């Protein structure tokens, strides 16, 4: 009867500790003891990490509001040290269920090697990589229980900082319309070999192409050779993960020159690719012919 | 459930090492009072610093109607090499590339999308310049907020550099040493960059449509052919060859061409051969 008494008081002080957690009132009523322990331990670890920073304002809350992705800091062992609340908006899983667990239990298997090489033309500590994370979201909300969770491609960018942490902002690649359209972008559709099957009419204003002439042509013929490798890698990602974001690259205009571009590509359903290209520049070197088609059109 | 009791042991030991100031429930008691020694998981200030540790960016707030800068954070100085002197008192259009003004104005329009609506765009902004301004690509994400005339709408945004990998000649800072070309499998020039003009004396259009063999010394032509056939039978691995190239003027030049086939990432068909042609 003394063993019980002690265990009952253990559960009581553990529930009191759950009441000390930095969450709204009543949330602790939905937690189990293991989750209480995990969240308290991770809270103390994150406080130790934030205390090591060498530095109250009402404009602070703007920062997470201005971001589109979510905050994630991972330890050197791969455990999710911290996630911001808006993670629920991107993966369905909340920070309550994810803080204190290992990232590898929520990453696609074939991405674990990439992440492991990230946790150990680019500044030495800066990190850019795509990661498939478990998400329970559909267009109707959080409708998937964890075992039918789908893979969501996240463009992760951040820094190795110093224990050593990897601090990332992780952003979702939106899935791709009707006039009137905006400026600084156009849309294209390709087969999996990246041959044009459709292209926005705005291309005529952007690069001077009529969309009908692009139909059937390989997209790789329209990139600057200097951007060869990078675009290749992007497409490889697009082919293995389902979505990708390219770097800045030069797209060749019809009669000469090029313009700076960055595109988001998504595989859709037998399968095809949709590209949303955001323009960075207007046509540069307009009087310079670079490709054979460019000099065939300059005449 | 033997696992369940054993993870709870480990946890109590982790919290043991976490609380600075025993038996498990004594651990829990002192951890309760320690937690009460210190509602969100992190403070807004902490999260701000975390975000600034992740992104190379700065927060700005500008009026939607005129672009007038109403706030910029001090991290604009390390990011853009720009004093806050340059932003406060100006408009965002003063900072961006002229070619971006229209786009900016459209992003700042709240006609169809207003309070709480999101914005995401790319522009080029002025950085610190010693002697003609120099622009850098900035990715901006933010939201529309009524700013307390009446309460005018404002864009509250973060602008970041280096969201992806950055996108040449690097051994001679003055005159180009090489140029890149592309060829069909037949060897015809289908792409050349303008450095050709400085390296071999030809305008790009003087090479496009012609075969690379047409510029190779006859005594070296068979060697060049062999090397190209070999690179076609390899799949992406680079192979080098050295041969005498005929200049538009100024005689024969020793030239190192290192080539590899571009494989379609899906169909694995040859898109073209890529060549780096370097004057030896």
Residue numbers in the entry:
A (entry chain B): 19 to 73, 80 to 144, 154 to 195, 214 to 227, 230 to 322, 329 to 358
B (entry chain A): 98 to 118, 126 to 142, 156 to 229, 255 to 273, 300 to 316, 331 to 349, 352 to 464
Give the authors' words:
Hypoxia-inducible factors (HIFs) are α/β heterodimeric transcription factors modulating cellular responses to the low oxygen condition. Hypoxia-inducible factors (HIFs) belong to the basic helix-loop-helix PER-ARNT-SIM (bHLH-PAS) family of transcription factors, which sense physiological changes or environmental stimuli and respond by modulating target gene expression. There are three HIF-α isoforms in mammals (HIF-1α, HIF-2α, and HIF-3α), each encoded by a different gene. Through crystallographic analysis of HIF-3 α/β heterodimer in both apo and OEA-bound forms, hydrogen-deuterium exchange mass spectrometry (HDX-MS), molecular dynamics (MD) simulations, and biochemical and cell-based assays, we unveil the molecular mechanism of OEA entry and binding to the PAS-B pocket of HIF-3α, and show that it leads to enhanced heterodimer stability and functional modulation of HIF-3.
Interestingly, the potential role of HIF-3α as a lipid sensor was suggested mainly based on the crystal structure of its PAS-B domain in complex with bacterial lipids, which remained bound within the cavity during protein expression, purification and crystallization. Here, we began by examining the overall heterodimeric structure of HIF-3α-ARNT complex, consisting of the N-terminal segments (including the bHLH, PAS-A and PAS-B domains as shown in Fig. 1a) from both proteins. To fully visualize the ligand-binding potential of HIF-3α, we crystallized the multi-domain mouse HIF-3α-ARNT complex and solved its structure at 2.3 Å resolution. Each asymmetric unit of the crystal contained a single heterodimer. Meanwhile as shown in the superimposition of these two structures, the N-terminal α helix in the bHLH domain of HIF-3α is slightly longer and rotated about 10° relative to that of HIF-2α. However, it remains unclear if this distinction is real or artificial, as it may have risen only due to the differences in their respective crystal packings that impact this region. In our study, protein production of the multi-domain HIF-3α-ARNT heterodimer in E. coli only yielded an apo form with no discernible ligand present in the PAS-B domain of HIF-3α or elsewhere in the complex. The contrasting finding about the pocket contents of overexpressed HIF-3α proteins suggests that although bacteria-derived lipids can bind to HIF-3α, their ease of removal during purification is consistent with their reversible binding capability. As calculated by Fpocket program, we didn’t find a sizeable pocket in the HIF-3α PAS-A domain, but observed an empty cavity of about 280 Å3 within the PAS-B domain, comparable in size to the corresponding HIF-2α pocket. This vacancy provided us with a clear opportunity to screen small-molecule libraries to identify unique molecules capable of binding to HIF-3α selectively. The tunnel entrance was mainly surrounded and sealed by four residues, G237 at Aβ, R255 at Cα helix, V259 at Cα helix, and L338 at Iβ strand, in the apo HIF-3α structure.
